[PDB]
Amino acid sequence: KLKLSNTVLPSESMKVVAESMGIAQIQEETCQLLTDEVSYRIKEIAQDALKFMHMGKRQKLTTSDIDYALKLKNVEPLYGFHAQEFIPFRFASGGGRELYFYEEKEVDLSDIINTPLPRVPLDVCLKAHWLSIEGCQPAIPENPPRLKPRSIHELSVEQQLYYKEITEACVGSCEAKRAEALQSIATDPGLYQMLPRFSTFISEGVRVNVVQNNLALLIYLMRMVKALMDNPTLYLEKYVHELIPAVMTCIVSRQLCLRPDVDNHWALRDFAARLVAQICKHFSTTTNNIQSRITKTFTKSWVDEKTPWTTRYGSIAGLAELGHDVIKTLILPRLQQEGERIRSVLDGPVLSNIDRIGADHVQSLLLKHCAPVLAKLRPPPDNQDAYRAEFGSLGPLLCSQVVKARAQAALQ
């Protein structure tokens, strides 16, 4: 079965061209005579431009194929103009005209000068790799993808040794070892079918690593989670039910080790955990299961009375990094409670506990989020004392942060 037809250009476009040139009162047989001649020349060239596509080993007819197909038929590749003498440009392609259907048809002559020129890409280089090693294709990134018998483990001993080396490097005794092992996790194509043992090693580790709050052990495991996520080959949402309660525990947990000093890292432990938490709510998303579940746990962590302030700071960070609208709709009705908590830490003399440090970190983070939440939905008018209607927390310093954001927008 082949219902191949012969499609020509419409004749009602050929009369428009003729009467816009000075040739009026053309017959229909005169006009049909134009549109079978030019529709043959388009068919003659597109069949001849397909020879250059095949010879150049491409599957896409580029714009230069018609320039050589025209030159082959002794017609000048010039499209915009036609030179009768032909001596200024002799069969020289000018690359066509960059024109559109939805164009503006008028530009300002200094708009084209002030725009930055595009980057000239890298020159052609010759890299070698291996498609086949004695018959087997390697999984390198240059490649696409009655007694019952004694059973064998589903991992090879080179794979099991690889797992042992990667896990003993990812506990961060040496930093270069970690970084390679993290890149190895980030781009090994054959790291599926080992992924249950990695997920179990992560999950089990954090739970027996928060019994004593060992921050490095945790910072290395969170970097291992981040290296597991950006690998494009492996299928992760079968294992995310073990991954997510591990990161929530890094963010919402108390620190058994020295309260101050590494709290700076603790904020980053909660910074790395809140980053990977909102990356996990960005991926793996179905209706009303993952993002809303962690949002509900974060909100009941917040509205809980008389929290641990480490848990409070971590949950505050976690709800803070959830995007544009989430702070637009959630952090709004709660400023008074935040201020009251800050006032209590301030009044009670107790300084040797971690409450004061937790309070300062929470207030700074909340104030930065409130700044753009404001820069985003209102003009920057009355930035001096109008914020005193919102208990006067960040006030003029919040206004200065909004001004810095406006300066960054101007730079953009």
Binding site: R207, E237, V240, M248, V252, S284, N289, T297, P308
Partner: peptide
């Protein structure tokens, strides 16, 4: 549509919130 593979992935079928360790001891 309730036989879709996702319904059976254990993120959508497990109360994994209970695992998060809060103030453990």
């Amino acid at each position: 549509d309730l036989l879709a593979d996702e319904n059976f992935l254990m993120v959508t079928q497990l109360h994994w919130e209970d695992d998060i360790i809060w103030d453990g001891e």
